[PDB]
Amino acid sequence: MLEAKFEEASLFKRIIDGFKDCVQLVNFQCKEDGIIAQAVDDSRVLLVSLEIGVEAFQEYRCDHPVTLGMDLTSLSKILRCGNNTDTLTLIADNTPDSIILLFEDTKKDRIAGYSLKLMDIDADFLKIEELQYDSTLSLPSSEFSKIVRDLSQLSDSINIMITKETIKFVADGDIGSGSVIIKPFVDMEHPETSIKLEMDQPVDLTFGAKYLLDIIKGSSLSDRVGIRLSSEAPALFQFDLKSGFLQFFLAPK
Amino acid sequence: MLEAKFEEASLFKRIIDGFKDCVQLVNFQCKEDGIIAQAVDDSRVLLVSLEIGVEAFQEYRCDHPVTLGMDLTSLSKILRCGNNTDTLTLIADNTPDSIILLFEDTKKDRIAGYSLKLMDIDADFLKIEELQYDSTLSLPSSEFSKIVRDLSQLSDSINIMITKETIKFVADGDIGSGSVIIKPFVDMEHPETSIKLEMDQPVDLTFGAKYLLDIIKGSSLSDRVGIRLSSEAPALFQFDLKSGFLQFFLAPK
């Protein structure tokens, strides 16, 4: 048996939102300390990686390991029906054919439950090693969205350059041309607004805008996003959850 | 989908307690206005009949009719695990192979769920008609237990006679012999303790003690029990629930 209950259904919706647009079928591997879910883009360009620990749930129980392979387009249509402020409880038995999603509001005395047919996903193992990066930075995730959403109009590629106190984004296409420079800064009154940069080595990297358009969809999960960049390895984008994260690994062109 | 949630798991335990000892396999027929479950004794002597309306649950949802055929010995072993003060939620999908029982305590942040395999019961339809009875009476259900438990030791049969202000029980066997006479009475300060009798016609009936031993197991569900007796028809024993009842129909020897 598995019982994983979110205080706010919304949390789970937004988790599925960072995923559904760039991968369709994902296994969710539940065990005693919580859930990880990890998927590749088809084209092997984008790896997505979720961790939700026990502490993220209102109440959680998983005595024996289960894999919940579920279609995110389907899952997402069921999640659409929940009030975004409801209780969400996931329930699945020992060897599951199905998952049960149960929206509950103890205030209004309203209860709803939906059933989602699990499927056999059979994905490639993902070997995600822990690395050292040339540069590390954080900023409000919504500042990151706005830059990505704006420059994306102009080019399929966005170039990111990091130099001593400079984070530079550039997009150059057929119609137009964009350039944004942000500087690390400490915000006395509002530290959540700060841009932090830690640079061991300058970096200069190009990424497909389409993939950055996918990653910025993790934004609703966290005020801030952490970007780790390196000349040899894929870049890493991370949105911290209360007791977990959503990570994207992206390869430069 | 079906979601039927009891504020107190205990209510459901005691409901299953009035049943499990005299019938093993019962269908529970859920629909929009709630659940009825009805079973015969093998020997066709004892009919059991449950009604639980919507108002009996904390929250209830059943849009489409489902039959939950379940083994009460099994069901009862799962129910044993619940804290008697917990939340119990029953969940079953559209066409169910299984039922899910979910014990929850929002105070301790403890959650447990168990799965029970439904089975195909195939019972006889029960034609339960509404009748006129010679005599009708109520009394504390626990007074009824004590009389039945005591006289049962002495004889496989208990004789019940009703005359103008007299309710008489008699048991006569090989070892011993018992006689209890209770008189209708109004209890000023404590009306729940009253014995009420309404007699249209005297009655004189014998019943198998074993079957009365089964019926008095409905006692934990209600302070009072109503007994309706007639010379032509089976006797009717009823424990009222908050918005339903548990009935037993019993044929005299």
From Swiss-Prot, chains A, B:
Record carries keyword S-adenosyl-L-methionine: no
From the record heading this protein, give the residue positions of the covalent cross-link Glycyl lysine isopeptide (Lys-Gly) (interchain with G-Cter in SUMO): 127, 164
Primary subcellular site in the record, as a coarse category: nucleus
Organism in which the protein naturally occurs? Saccharomyces cerevisiae (strain ATCC 204508 / S288c) (Baker's yeast)
Q: Which PROSITE patterns match?
A: PCNA_1 (PS01251), PCNA_2 (PS00293)
Q: Which residue numbers delimit the DNA-binding region?
A: 61-80
Kindly provide the name given to this protein in its UniProt entry: Proliferating cell nuclear antigen
Query: Which terms in the GO cellular component ontology are assigned?
Result: chromosome, telomeric region; nucleus; PCNA complex; replication fork
The Swiss-Prot or TrEMBL record describes its family as follows:
Belongs to the PCNA family.
Q: Where in the cell is it found?
A: Nucleus
Query: Which SUPFAM superfamilies does this UniProt record tie to the protein?
Result: DNA clamp (SSF55979)
Keyword list (alphabetical) reads: DNA damage, DNA repair, DNA replication, DNA-binding, Isopeptide bond, Nucleus, Ubl conjugation
According to the lineage, what is the superkingdom?
Answer: Eukaryota
Q: How does it assemble?
A: Homotrimer. Interacts with RAD30. Interacts with MCM10. Interacts with UBP10.
GO MF annotations in UniProt: DNA binding; DNA polymerase processivity factor activity; identical protein binding
Q: Does the keyword Nucleotide-binding apply?
A: no
The cross-link described as Glycyl lysine isopeptide (Lys-Gly) (interchain with G-Cter in ubiquitin) comes at: 164
Q: What does the UniProt record tell us about how this protein is modified after translation? A: Sumoylated on Lys-164, and to a lesser extent on Lys-127 by the UBC9/SIZ1 complex during S-phase; which impairs ubiquitination and function in DNA repair. Monoubiquitinated on Lys-164 by the UBC2/RAD18 complex upon DNA damage, and then polyubiquitinated through 'Lys-63'-linkage by UBC13/MMS2. Ubiquitination is required for UBC2-mediated DNA repair.
Q: Gene3D superfamilies attached here? A: DNA Polymerase III, subunit A, domain 2
Pfam families, per the entry:
PCNA_C, PCNA_N
Q: What does this protein do?
A: This protein is an auxiliary protein of DNA polymerase delta and is involved in the control of eukaryotic DNA replication by increasing the polymerase's processibility during elongation of the leading strand. Involved in DNA repair.
